[PDB]
Amino acid sequence: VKKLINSQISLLIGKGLHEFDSLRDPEVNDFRTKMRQFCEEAAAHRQQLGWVEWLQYSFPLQLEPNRALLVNVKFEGSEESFTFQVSTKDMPLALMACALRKKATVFRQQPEEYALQVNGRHEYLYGNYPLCHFQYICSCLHSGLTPHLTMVHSSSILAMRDEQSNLWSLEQPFSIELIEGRKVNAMKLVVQAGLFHGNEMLCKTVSSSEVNVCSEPVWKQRLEFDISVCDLPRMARLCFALYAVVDCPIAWANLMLFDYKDQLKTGERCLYMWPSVLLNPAGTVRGNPNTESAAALVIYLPEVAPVYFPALEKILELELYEHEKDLVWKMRHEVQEHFPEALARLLLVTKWNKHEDVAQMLYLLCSWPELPVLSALELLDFSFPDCYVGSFAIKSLRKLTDDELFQYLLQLVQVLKYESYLDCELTKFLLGRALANRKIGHFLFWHLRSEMHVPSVALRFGLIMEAYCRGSTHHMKVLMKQGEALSKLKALNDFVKVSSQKTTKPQTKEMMHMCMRQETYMEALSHLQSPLDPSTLLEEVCVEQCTFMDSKMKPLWIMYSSEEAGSAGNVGIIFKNGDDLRQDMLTLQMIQLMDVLWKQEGLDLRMTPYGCLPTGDRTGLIEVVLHSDTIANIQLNKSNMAATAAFNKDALLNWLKSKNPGEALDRAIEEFTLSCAGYCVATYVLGIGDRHSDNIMIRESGQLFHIDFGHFLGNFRVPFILTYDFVHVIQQGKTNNSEKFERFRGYCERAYTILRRHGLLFLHLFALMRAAGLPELSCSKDIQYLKDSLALGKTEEEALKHFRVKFNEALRESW
Ligand SMILES: Cc1ccccc1-n1c(Cn2nc(C#CCO)c3c(N)ncnc32)nc2cccc(C)c2c1=O
């Protein structure tokens, strides 16, 4: 049976476990077995959680950042249901009290023994919270809909839990022998080596001598570095570049001078090199897995005697101008005593190529108080390679709530790429958090699963997903069920592209359905948790309603229903294969983040944060927003329709009218204006260009939102943007309506200002994303786009002035 589990894992993680053994690699082995131990202890913990604690683990609450309402409630056993009137202000327990008072009266006759499930969802209502704090209850009020809940008894919840069971002495200047290579070019070759700690070099980059273009080159020479061997910090990173010239890059390669046992490396080494777009400190520190084809650099770390980096207790024993640096360093204790939040800045002035200073720094670091989360996110930047700093940052990060953790999960995952060794605090942290919360577990998995086609991370990511699994057998099954669905989706989509290239849409659509109607597909595509959101159940796929966009990548449109979930189980997923969804996902997360920040100062711009989730190689899902359509479509202004207008500019408004009769119209225009402001500021701050009426959509509520991102931070300076046809809708259909127009400027103005206040949060976040290799996010010039857009260097009186110019500027540009 342990064989079954094993093969399921390899199947799930897209890498077979045998590959881990084949490497006969102590680091991997250690990682594997420690991390297995760790996770199995988590899982053990879990299997004995109390039932309310299990609910917390498995269906964590979904909260928002007096008045009446109809709620429909019923119990698990029977179909009989009651529709109560309760306040929006009542705790779930009041509602439960009612249910039971009604059950008792009908059924002829203990609220604390219950949780309320949202029907047809993995979602629950419990805790000491008024109902309109629950996103679902909240969502329902906004759309008019009657919450539909089931009284689920403690014995039943427990029944679920049960089913889910499983030194200083060495002062000579550091040096290497470059022996030779085995590679491909056109011209002479050179090797450049430099020793890095983070971005900053520990001295100059002693190159090679020029040698002929050749294929199996030989060097046999000492390169000696301008730094004492007893200096080298724990995280010293030796970096090579191989190029050709009469400048033209071929390959690059990095390694730690110390290994994971804190032993300085000796002697020889063959470095399987990575292809080029000269020096790449950021790049991974483990070799190219394609050993057949890769250029190989053989080098010689010499035996300076074994040599270990000193224990902590031995250590404990022992932008700004030149002088300013000197002063911080001097005032470092006082910096610790009175400004504990300036650590980053002090850390960037400590002399990392002088061991004594790194001792003095560390000793302060070791007594340093914990920092706020925002500061910790900054310390995770690659500028802080030291693991004592890493350890510090994780320790400060422990106070992250699950919602926040979820919020920055994509970034923390990306930062694993910076990591120097497989076993590290960040891995332990995330795994601990993922094992403690099934939603984090879900998304960690997919963040990882989705990058397995990527050589430099395949091993690392593979090993974590393995760990996770050892820690959650049941969740593993739930995830294979997702994997099988995505596998069928890929097959289905390939059929679609081949076929559509030979036949009319109607025909391929017919063909797609037959394919889908195969037992093997109905089985695969049904009865699963959405990878976009584990608390959304994809029950039966509605073949009749599925189709595909007959352009470009031919993405698929997959609809699903649920009897038990009714309306709210009528949900859809888009499956796209062929494009990178990373850019899209990132963009959508940042907007979602804007929305959370705005709501936290009580400003709700009625945003539409739909899931977008990469799952594999140029493959992921996008969550369908129903009841929506593009501006472009609407603006096609077709005859024999409700919106049929005398003037094109009326199209969009007629559409809204037709979707929103009588008194409803006002609120629609209101939703439109609110979301409009939101999206306007978000695209503007983010530098999202090439908006046009094809990539904007409105929902029937009037809510406006954006699709197909792929160009941000100004990677065409993006002006703020006002479309006349929106300005026309904001104005209630009037040529001049400056009451309504200026309320709009107001909203834009509030949302702009709130974002500036968390400017640092975006910066630190994007800082972390640089780890991802997204081509529109490659260097400073990009993070600078954000500084400029949030005019972060200015005062709030100023920036607002600045913004006002831009906004008026956009107004002129509107017709
Ligand atoms: C539904 C629709 C109306 C107007 C114009 C285009 C669409 N649309 C869209 C427009 N669209 N784009 C979306 C997106 C995205 C990420 O950039 C999207 C969404 N999340 N929810 C609803 N609609 C969305 N996407 C499709 C994807 C696959 C298959 C199909 C048939 C479509 C599709 O028809």
mmCIF file with all atom_site columns, C-alpha atoms in Angstrom, residues 3 10 20 153 205 237 282 408 422 424 477 495 530-531 616-617 729:
data_model
loop_
_atom_site.group_PDB
_atom_site.id
_atom_site.type_symbol
_atom_site.label_atom_id
_atom_site.label_alt_id
_atom_site.label_comp_id
_atom_site.label_asym_id
_atom_site.label_entity_id
_atom_site.label_seq_id
_atom_site.pdbx_PDB_ins_code
_atom_site.Cartn_x
_atom_site.Cartn_y
_atom_site.Cartn_z
_atom_site.occupancy
_atom_site.B_iso_or_equiv
_atom_site.pdbx_formal_charge
_atom_site.auth_seq_id
_atom_site.auth_comp_id
_atom_site.auth_asym_id
_atom_site.auth_atom_id
_atom_site.pdbx_PDB_model_num
ATOM 1  C CA . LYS A 1 3   ? 3.795   1.524  -3.083  1.00 0.00 ? 3   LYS A CA 1
ATOM 2  C CA . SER A 1 10  ? 4.851   10.703 -8.757  1.00 0.00 ? 10  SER A CA 1
ATOM 3  C CA . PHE A 1 20  ? 15.142  11.474 -6.418  1.00 0.00 ? 20  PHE A CA 1
ATOM 4  C CA . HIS A 1 153 ? -24.033 18.303 13.147  1.00 0.00 ? 153 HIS A CA 1
ATOM 5  C CA . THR A 1 205 ? 35.536  39.943 -10.795 1.00 0.00 ? 205 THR A CA 1
ATOM 6  C CA . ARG A 1 237 ? 28.240  32.482 -3.722  1.00 0.00 ? 237 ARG A CA 1
ATOM 7  C CA . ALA A 1 282 ? 20.570  35.749 -8.707  1.00 0.00 ? 282 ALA A CA 1
ATOM 8  C CA . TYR A 1 408 ? 1.249   36.989 -0.368  1.00 0.00 ? 408 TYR A CA 1
ATOM 9  C CA . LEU A 1 422 ? 16.850  22.629 -0.148  1.00 0.00 ? 422 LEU A CA 1
ATOM 10 C CA . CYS A 1 424 ? 15.434  25.977 4.670   1.00 0.00 ? 424 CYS A CA 1
ATOM 11 C CA . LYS A 1 477 ? -6.490  12.121 -3.773  1.00 0.00 ? 477 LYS A CA 1
ATOM 12 C CA . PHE A 1 495 ? -8.728  18.025 -30.233 1.00 0.00 ? 495 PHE A CA 1
ATOM 13 C CA . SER A 1 530 ? -12.170 23.764 -8.425  1.00 0.00 ? 530 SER A CA 1
ATOM 14 C CA . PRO A 1 531 ? -8.427  24.408 -8.672  1.00 0.00 ? 531 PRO A CA 1
ATOM 15 C CA . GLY A 1 616 ? 1.178   23.548 -15.798 1.00 0.00 ? 616 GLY A CA 1
ATOM 16 C CA . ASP A 1 617 ? 3.186   24.421 -18.894 1.00 0.00 ? 617 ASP A CA 1
ATOM 17 C CA . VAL A 1 729 ? -22.536 56.237 -18.408 1.00 0.00 ? 729 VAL A CA 1
#
